Specification:
Blueprint lengths: L13 E3 L5 E5 L5 H12 L1 H7 L3 E5 L2 E5 L8 E7 L14 E5 L15 H12 L6 H22 L4 E2 L4 E7 L5 E6 L5 E2 L5 H19 L2
The structure holds the ligand O=P(O)(O)O[C@H]1[C@H](OP(=O)(O)O)[C@@H](OP(=O)(O)O)[C@H](O)[C@@H](O)[C@@H]1OP(=O)(O)O, adenosine-5'-diphosphate and magnesium ion (MG) (2 copies).
One magnesium ion (MG) binds next to loops.
């Protein structure tokens, strides 16, 4: 009666909660992810409310988090790592696509270093389940750009190093609903300045999505 959550990337044990709208993520290595949710909650509460799934509680080593997929009939999900990797450089220069819904169909490989063209093509791949209605897909891109724009603006005033953090892009097959949020705070660190490397990941994504929203 344990139901494994269909992650798109990561190595962490994630299960469905025993009740609706909750997933349980195991803190495998340390409780640093909980320490960081609590720090952001006390120092950057606005950031937490706008950009981050709700943390409802802790049970031993499990975080009870808002299921970002819960309100969707046919969610498509993409995990894009915008914070630094442990040692390796990013597969797309400023960020790494770690996975998306149906990526096996397009021979996506998270180990593969990509050109600009292949990066753009993988984001186009992720958008294909959104069907042939250009106005509807454009509105999904424009809503993502609206929220990433405000995130990149707000990041200038946040003194955290967002190591390992991902953007979770979600849209419904019908293109009636979409969202992007920040997840995975296990390696976030306190620092004296803002994280310019993470801000460049977001502004590069805003550039790519803008080209897609505008193409003829
Ligand atoms: O740092 P990166 O991008 O190398 O990602 C590495 C992850 O670190 P983070 O998710 O914190 O960045 C590791 O997670 P944690 O020990 O933190 O669970 C994960 O287990 C590795 O498989 C992954 O290596 P890769 O995907 O490159 O084979
Ligand atoms: N709150 C959430 N709601 C829905 N899916 C989530 C949520 N948090 C994580 N995920 C899913 O789990 C995957 C891994 O999440 P993440 O927190 O990055 O774990 P890890 O620390 O193991 O990398 C994401 O790619 C996404 O598919
Ligand atoms: Mg992660
Ligand atoms: Mg992690």
């Amino acid at each position: 009666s344990i139901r494994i959550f269909p992650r798109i990337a990561g190595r962490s044990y994630i299960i469905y909660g025993q009740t609706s709208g909750i997933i349980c993520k195991r803190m495998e290595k340390s409780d640093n992810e909980f320490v960081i949710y609590n720090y952001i909650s006390e120092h950057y509460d606005k950031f937490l409310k706008k950009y981050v799934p709700k943390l409802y509680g802790k049970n031993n080593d499990m975080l009870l988090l808002e299921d970002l997929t819960y309100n969707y009939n046919n969610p498509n999900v993409m995990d894009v790592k915008i914070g630094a990797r442990k040692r390796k450089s990013h597969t797309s220069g400023f960020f790494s696509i770690r996975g998306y819904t149906n990526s096996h169909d397009y021979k996506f490989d998270p180990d593969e270093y990509l050109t600009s063209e292949s990066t753009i093509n993988h984001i186009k791949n992720f958008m294909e389940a959104g069907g042939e209605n250009r106005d509807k897909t454009k509105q999904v891109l424009l809503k993502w750009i609206m929220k990433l724009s405000e995130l990149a603006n707000d990041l200038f005033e946040i003194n955290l190093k967002f190591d390992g953090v991902s953007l979770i892009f979600i849209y419904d097959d019908d293109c009636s609903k979409c969202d992007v949020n920040v997840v995975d705070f296990s390696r976030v660190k306190l620092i004296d300045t803002n994280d310019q490397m993470t801000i460049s990941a977001v502004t590069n994504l805003i550039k790519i999505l803008s080209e897609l929203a505008d193409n003829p």
